[PDB]
Design a protein around this ligand. Structure first.
Ligand SMILES: COC(=O)[C@@H]1C[C@@H](O)CN1C(=O)c1ccco1
Ligand SMILES: [Zn+2]
Ligand SMILES: [Zn+2]
Ligand SMILES: [Zn+2]
Length: 572
């Protein structure tokens, strides 16, 4: 019970017993906490509760010190001192923002704003607290039981009465019972098992709530600026292919950490892998939150880096199919590609953390705790999608509040910015450059004259809360008959239920805006489906239209985003 104050580091025997994390609070801070919030239980070796038998007084403001013991106003001895007095709570070794983080339910955006504007120790407190709250919320959902098995990829479920049903999509991974993790999509429903198993009737599935470990390392280490490249040894013979990033690679060796903003198709993977060719002796650990982002770094490394010095770290609890061309789980190889949740405890000359808009402050801290590096490089784009905040229902979370890295990129600017989009036809580059990049993103490709927009509200239907717009899919079908080259297009929408309907009617491969991030396709057909804050989110809109290399067809619902699209308008 002897620890350090989460607000001023002063040693104390006190912990808040009403806080879900039970943080150590010193005498000065513990008082300021209990007197301002509903939190009145204070813990030490022994809790601050009335020692008199049968007495249920646990409020520290109603308790006193009777010799070396604690009693309430009804049981205290004549010579007794209040525990709460003189701006302090008695203990050993004798904040407005800490109060709000400790008591908030994490359903408002203002909660996440505070979690990113507070001090560094409060960012960790905020991140463990939020993650613990997100986990305890998983238990609130009802158990799903197999009623009947139709085929190898379709079934019917029975839900627990009195408990809400969790939204059916890929963002919700059930744990089957220990018969492997499973996922669901919309009485015909689709079952998806990680471990192949002959679907058992009666066997149940439950969202496996994982334990929230405490945070020790900061989100960002303290920044250091050096006079020369430190601990890294550059080449002189540097491939012309990567010469455009030499000044930026040197910037990386002259700072403890650096931020890189890379809009879609500006060369982020190319920069990440090229940094290994610039410091050829350096041991680089490549990390991201998702397996897809780590796999995209593996694909780029396979093309430029020696395969024998690469290793893809895969957790023994192998959830989904990932990169197979490196030696698996060899932590000591020069190049280690691994998700944040699977990071081993090791050191590196450079740590590259990719897809930074998808990281939370919890992930930022874990990386600093498992990896001790000479240099840390954060790559991503705050104009792209953030990690889903399952508890957030009220307010919109702005890019400067995604995490510490995003906050820096939106306030003091990124250290480096990849200014030329090489993927998209100019119509798309011109649209997103004005929308989210302050006109600083430039097009490399010409206008393709294959970027179309159509304003068509259709009819909005719902599969619970996930939306469907069948008339917008009907407009796509009409378009495909008249433009059969577009049959090679990927259908994209902000809703999985819209995607499910379009998969059956159009036969095109399907992808939500959120799962399309990081990928590129020749042709994209996007239906906005609705005009909600979700389908109108500028970061989501930016990701949606920057997936295309050649052509895009946008069937729009919102007049605003439709008018901003610098595309050829279509009629019907
Ligand atoms: C990369 O951006 C382009 O290619 C743009 C859009 C394309 O339609 C024409 N273009 C020109 O730069 C240009 C200058 C003079 C005549 O055209
Ligand atoms: Zn304190
Ligand atoms: Zn508390
Ligand atoms: Zn009492």
């Amino acid at each position: 019970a002897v620890g350090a104050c989460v607000l001023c580091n002063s040693q104390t025997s006190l912990r808040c017993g009403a806080c879900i994390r039970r943080p150590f609070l010193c005498c000065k801070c513990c008082y300021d906490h209990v007197i301002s919030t509903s939190h009145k239980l204070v813990l030490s070796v022994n809790p601050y509760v009335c020692n008199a038998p049968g007495c249920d007084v646990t409020d520290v403001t109603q308790l006193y010190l009777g010799g070396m013991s604690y009693y309430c106003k009804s049981h205290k001895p004549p010579i007794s001192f209040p525990l709460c007095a003189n701006g302090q709570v008695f203990g050993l070794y004798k904040v407005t923002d800490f109060n709000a983080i400790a008591t908030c339910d994490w359903t408002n955006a203002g909660d996440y704003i505070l979690a990113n504007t507070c001090t560094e120790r409060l960012k960790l407190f905020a991140a463990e607290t939020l993650k613990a709250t997100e986990e305890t919320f998983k238990l609130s959902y009802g158990i799903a039981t197999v009623r009947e098995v139709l085929s190898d990829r379709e079934l019917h479920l029975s839900w627990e009465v009195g408990k809400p049903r969790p939204p059916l999509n890929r963002n919700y991974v059930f744990t089957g019972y220990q018969i492997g993790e499973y996922t669901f999509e919309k009485d015909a429903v689709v079952y998806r098992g990680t471990t192949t198993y002959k679907l058992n009737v009666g066997d149940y599935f439950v969202l496996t709530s994982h334990t929230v470990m405490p945070l020790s390392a900061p989100t960002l280490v303290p920044q250091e600026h050096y006079v020369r490249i430190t601990g890294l040894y550059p080449t002189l013979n540097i491939s012309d292919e990567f010469s455009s990033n030499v000044a930026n690679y040197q910037k990386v060796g002259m700072q403890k950490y650096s931020t890189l903003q890379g809009p879609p198709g500006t060369g982020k993977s190319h920069f990440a892998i090229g940094l290994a060719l610039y410091y050829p002796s350096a041991r680089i650990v490549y990390t991201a939150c998702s397996h897809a982002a780590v796999d995209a770094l593996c694909e780029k490394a396979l093309k430029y880096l020696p395969i024998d010095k690469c290793s893809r770290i895969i957790p023994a609890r192998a959830r989904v199919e990932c990169f197979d061309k490196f030696k698996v789980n060899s932590t000591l190889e020069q190049y280690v590609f691994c998700t944040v949740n699977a990071l081993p405890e090791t050191t590196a000359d450079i740590v590259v953390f990719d897809e930074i808009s998808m990281a939370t402050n919890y992930d930022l801290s874990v990386v600093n705790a498992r990896l001790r590096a000479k240099h840390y490089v954060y790559i991503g784009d705050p104009a792209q999608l953030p990690a889903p905040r399952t508890l957030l229902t009220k307010g919109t979370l702005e890019p400067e509040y995604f995490n510490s890295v995003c906050r820096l990129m939106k306030t003091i600017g990124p250290d480096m910015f990849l200014g030329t989009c090489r993927r998209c036809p100019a119509e798309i580059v011109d649209t997103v450059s004005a929308l989210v990049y302050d006109n600083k993103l430039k097009a490399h490709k010409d206008k393709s004259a294959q970027c179309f927009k159509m304003f068509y509200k259709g009819v909005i239907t719902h599969d619970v809360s996930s939306a469907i717009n069948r008339p917008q899919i009907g407009v796509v079908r009409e378009f495909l008959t008249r433009n059969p080259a577009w049959r090679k297009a990927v259908f994209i929408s902000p809703y999985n239920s819209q995607n499910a309907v379009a998969s059956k009617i159009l036969g095109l491969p399907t992808q939500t805006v959120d799962s399309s991030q990081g990928s590129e396709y020749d042709y994209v057909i996007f239906t906005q489906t609705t005009e909600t804050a979700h389908s109108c989110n500028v970061n989501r809109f930016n990701v949606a239209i920057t997936r295309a290399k050649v052509g895009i067809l946008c069937i729009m619902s919102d007049r605003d985003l439709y008018d901003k699209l610098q595309f050829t308008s279509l009629e019907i």
